[PDB]
Design a binder for this molecule. Structure first.
Ligand SMILES: OC[C@H]1O[C@H](O[C@H]2[C@H](O)[C@@H](O)[C@@H](O[C@H]3[C@H](O)[C@@H](O)[C@@H](O[C@H]4[C@H](O)[C@@H](O)[C@@H](O[C@H]5[C@H](O)[C@@H](O)[C@@H](O[C@H]6[C@H](O)[C@@H](O)[C@H](O)O[C@@H]6CO)O[C@@H]5CO)O[C@@H]4CO)O[C@@H]3CO)O[C@@H]2CO)[C@H](O)[C@@H](O)[C@@H]1O
Ligand SMILES: OC[C@H]1O[C@H](O[C@H]2[C@H](O)[C@@H](O)[C@@H](O[C@H]3[C@H](O)[C@@H](O)[C@@H](O[C@H]4[C@H](O)[C@@H](O)[C@@H](O)O[C@@H]4CO)O[C@@H]3CO)O[C@@H]2CO)[C@H](O)[C@@H](O)[C@@H]1O
Ligand SMILES: OC[C@H]1O[C@H](O[C@H]2[C@H](O)[C@@H](O)[C@@H](O[C@H]3[C@H](O)[C@@H](O)[C@@H](O)O[C@@H]3CO)O[C@@H]2CO)[C@H](O)[C@@H](O)[C@@H]1O
Ligand SMILES: OC[C@H]1O[C@H](O[C@H]2[C@H](O)[C@@H](O)[C@@H](O[C@H]3[C@H](O)[C@@H](O)[C@@H](O)O[C@@H]3CO)O[C@@H]2CO)[C@H](O)[C@@H](O)[C@@H]1O
Ligand SMILES: [Ca+2]
Ligand SMILES: [Ca+2]
Ligand SMILES: [Ca+2]
Length: 686
């Protein structure tokens, strides 16, 4: 199977995701529609079920709506069973139409469909080479009150019909009872209730195993991706252990939703995306895009900055899910706005690095403010829109031109409003020119690219006022005029002689697990695969062709390895660093250190004898540890993914910048549980 195959559950870079808000997409089966006050067939009240279901999606898949657009993957709402109550928030009735109020992760939302329906959906999708990504909010269940078991459904958690427990009288401790968060701090937003949502307690073995077990089911149902909701409100350590469970079972492309406000650039975010075991939704990208094309709060320069920075801050930038809007923010298009702004933001996104995600209805020019105003039912399924044609013309590129999927990003021409960038990958190139200035044209001279000499027509067919590019010798493009609001796309594709790695997934797993290595120039005859200095060939290399290679992770020590391959001839390829070989099966372990006083700026960290602990390396130490919610200073705590069953030696550190002060005495010792969670409580040694 080629990298572009719908079977590629590890790489979406060649795909164009279509974010589908089920309830608001299409009602293929009204027999499952909810009744009474929880439903509004007219979709006037955006806080109630409108009827959108899985069958609706199947129909959309079969009727060529999505396919005709060039969509190769969908991102659907959480499939799990949600609460049935109609939460009345100050005289305002609310329903779980959004599917974020789960009540049983092992069951499905009868409103969307049945297991069978879901199965038919996946079947339909794959039949149309369409990948299926499902939302997953294992951070909570539903709204609930501790003193009012009457409100909502008390956040009651079910395990395939069997009541596990509720928020009230939670003597089991399945949830956190630290009130709500004010998003003041990361730890704050983690161990506190996301709004009024019953915050699950992943430190609880039951909850931990149940959740992991639940994902297994959906994984067995054939899903091709996982969009993790509120990845910022869940302990980072546990999520890794969760990614480990997935990857060590049935690895599938996963990305979390980590909100990033305007002009917000988080290192924690970069780190999470770099070591969580999952990617992230490129909010930084989206916000900048909006600032540049929608709000005009920044120019091409800010865009370029975002591009370069992100390409350096993200270990695997091509794994970041890009977008221009979503269900959590005002639709990119404003009723009064100039359509070209959206079309441009679209063209840009569809040709940039990462995995482009398109919010349903965007191609219909839907406008709307904050939720639920941004979740209106798709006005129509018209293929006549310009946005539709844009996507339609650009999307396929992600499959025909590896430069777009895995290529690099280099600015070739730039100014306040004009931006001309190039994507390169092997013998493939893509030059994109965007003139956001809707009132002024731009004289493009001195443009240099990697495009071989030749005449290049606009792949957009002048759709966005594009033009033909004339490339002479040296990649020098003859002077040309870039129409106002003009957007062109020139490309070059050719066979790649030398082995080039464009993607690798998953990026974190234990030996014996099969990773997927995509790119071009691998050759038909099997070659060699390197996990650092360790060479792997023959049998452990399940499959090998030109664009895709399947191989089992060698039994090497835990840690980061630099992947690389060599054709049957010995010709070595580029390097795809940052691969993580786990020490084995993982389990979320909570470490607690007491009496660890410190001074402002000084934060406690954790080090240990395993790669999951940094192998005694302070730079790779775990932390900074928390000390506010669950435990209070001088008491520090933190949930960490450690190799299960293993006997690990660990020590605590006191960090100040990169200056480290080691713990005294001897190493602490403990043996990781074989499964479930555990709490290692030790005192700081002077
Ligand atoms: O002791 C009292 C009480 O305290 C705590 O609870 C209070 C809470 O701390 C406090 O903030 C407040 O909460 C209210 C909030 O301030 C209001 O904004 C409102 O919330 C509405 C949201 O603004 C609105 O966007 C929407 O939110 C839901 C989304 O529609 C839905 O899609 C989903 O959001 C998901 C994102 O879309 C998705 O991308 C992402 O992946 O995951 C998100 C989360 O799943 O979920 C959103 C939340 O349901 O509707 C909201 C309407 O409810 O109402 C809040 C409730 O009043 O008051 C709280 C009560 O005082 C404690 O936590 C609590 O235990 C305690 O009783
Ligand atoms: O925004 C949240 C903050 O998060 C991070 O802060 C860390 C600090 O870097 C740590 O030093 C630690 O803070 C301890 C502090 O070490 C300790 O001395 C004590 O501070 C007292 C202080 O002695 C007293 O003079 C006065 O300042 O009151 C303080 C409160 O008692 O307690 C602190 C813990 O509350 O932990 C925090 C995280 O909680 C981050 O580095 C900061 O930028 C950020 O503000
Ligand atoms: O001496 C060679 C020269 O080449 C490289 O410059 C390129 C710029 O980096 C690139 O931005 C582009 O420049 C255009 C500007 O963006 C635009 O504002 C306007 O001024 O036209 C310019 C083209 O004439 O192209 C040039 C290459 O042509 C390299 O970065 C330089 O360091 C180097 O001096
Ligand atoms: O590097 C591997 C090694 O790391 C860990 O050892 C650290 C000690 O725990 C820590 O106390 C500190 O040791 C210094 C002593 O305190 C000091 O008295 C004198 O002996 O110098 C030491 C400096 O090396 O730092 C080391 C790491 O630098 C871990 O505990 C070991 O098990 C592990 O082998
Ligand atoms: Ca229905
Ligand atoms: Ca949480
Ligand atoms: Ca990298």
């Amino acid at each position: 199977a080629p990298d572009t195959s719908v079977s590629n559950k590890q790489n979406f870079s060649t795909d164009v995701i279509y974010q589908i808000f089920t309830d608001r997409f299409s009602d293929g089966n009204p027999a499952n529609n909810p009744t009474g006050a929880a439903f509004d067939g007219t979709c006037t009240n955006l806080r109630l079920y409108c009827g959108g279901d899985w069958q609706g999606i199947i129909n959309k898949i079969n009727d060529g709506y999505l396919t005709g657009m060039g969509v190769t993957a969908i991102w659907i709402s959480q499939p799990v069973e949600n609460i049935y109550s109609i939460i009345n928030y100050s005289g305002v009735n609310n329903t779980a139409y959004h599917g974020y109020w789960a009540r049983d992760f092992k069951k499905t939302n009868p409103a969307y469909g049945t297991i069978a329906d879901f199965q038919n959906l996946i079947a339909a999708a794959h039949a149309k080479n369409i990948k299926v990504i499902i939302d997953f909010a294992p951070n909570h269940t539903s709204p609930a009150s501790s003193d009012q078991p009457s409100f909502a459904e008390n956040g009651r958690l079910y395990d395939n019909g069997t009541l596990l427990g509720g928020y009230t009288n939670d003597t089991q401790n399945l949830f956190h009872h630290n009130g709500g968060t004010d998003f003041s701090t990361t730890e704050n937003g983690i161990y506190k209730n996301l709004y009024d949502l019953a915050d699950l307690n992943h430190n609880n073995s039951t909850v931990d195993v149940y959740l992991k077990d639940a994902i297994k089911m959906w994984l067995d149902l054939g899903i091709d991706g996982i969009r993790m909701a509120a990845v910022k409100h869940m302990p980072f350590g546990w999520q890794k252990s969760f990614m480990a469970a997935v990857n060590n079972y049935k690895p599938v492309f996963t990305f979390g939703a980590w909100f990033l406000g305007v002009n917000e650039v988080s290192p924690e975010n970069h780190k999470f995306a770099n070591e969580s075991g999952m990617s992230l939704l490129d909010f930084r990208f989206a916000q900048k895009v909006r600032q540049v094309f929608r709000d005009n709060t920044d120019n091409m320069y800010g865009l370029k900055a975002m591009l370069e920075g992100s390409a350096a801050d993200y270990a695997q930038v091509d794994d970041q899910v890009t977008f221009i809007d979503n269900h959590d923010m005002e639709r990119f298009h404003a009723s009064n706005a100039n359509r070209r702004k959206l079309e441009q933001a679209l063209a840009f996104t569809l040709t940039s690095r990462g995995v482009p995600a398109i919010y349903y209805g965007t191609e219909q020019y839907m406008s709307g403010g904050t939720d639920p105003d941004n979740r209106a039912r798709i006005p129509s399924f018209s293929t006549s829109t310009t946005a539709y044609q844009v996507i339609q013309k650009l999307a396929p590129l992600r499959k025909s031109n590896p430069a777009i999927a895995y290529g690099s990003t280099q600015e070739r021409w730039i100014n306040n409003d004009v931006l001309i960038y190039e994507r390169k990958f092997g013998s493939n190139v893509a030059v994109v020119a965007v003139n956001r200035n809707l009132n002024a044209p731009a004289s493009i001279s001195g443009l240099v690219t990697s495009l071989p000499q030749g005449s290049y027509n606009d792949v957009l067919g002048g759709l966005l006022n594009g033009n033909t590019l004339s490339v002479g010798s040296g990649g020098a493009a003859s002077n040309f005029t870039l129409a106002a609001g003009g957007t062109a796309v020139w490309q070059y594709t050719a066979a790649t002689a030398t082995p080039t790695i464009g993607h690798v997934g998953p990026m974190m797993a234990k030996p014996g697990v099969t990773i997927t290595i995509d790119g071009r120039g691998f050759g038909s005859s099997k070659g060699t695969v390197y996990f650092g200095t360790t060479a792997v060939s023959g049998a452990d290399i399940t499959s090998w062709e030109d664009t895709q290679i399947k191989v089992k992770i060698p039994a090497v020590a835990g840690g980061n390895y630099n992947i690389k391959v060599a054709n049957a001839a010995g010709t070595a390829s580029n390097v795809y660093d940052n691969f993580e070989v786990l020490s084995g099966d993982q389990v979320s372990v909570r470490f607690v250190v007491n009496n660890a006083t410190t001074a402002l700026g000084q934060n406690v960290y954790l080090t240990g004898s395993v790669s999951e602990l940094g192998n005694w390396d302070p730079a790779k130490a775990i932390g900074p540890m928390y000390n506010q919610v669950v435990y209070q200073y001088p008491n520090w705590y933190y949930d960490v993914s450690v190799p299960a069953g293993k006997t690990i030696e660990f020590k605590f550190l006191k960090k100040q910048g990169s200056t480290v002060t080691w713990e005294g005495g001897s190493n602490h010792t403990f043996t990781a549980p074989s499964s479930g969670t555990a709490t290692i409580n030790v005192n700081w040694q002077p």
